[PDB]
A and B are shown apart, each in its own frame.
Chain A
Amino acid sequence: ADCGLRPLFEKKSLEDKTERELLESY
């Protein structure tokens, strides 16, 4: 129920260095 939300990224509203490539492909 908290699955899939990373303490050091999503929870802080920070993006990792390549996840934009993932989202851009969708």
Chain B
Amino acid sequence: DFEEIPEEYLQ
């Protein structure tokens, strides 16, 4: 459902 966000943030 949610569009993936920059992995920069999921760090």
* A adjacent to B, CB under 8 Å: no
Binding site for B on A (CB under 8 A): none
Binding site for A on B (CB under 8 A): none
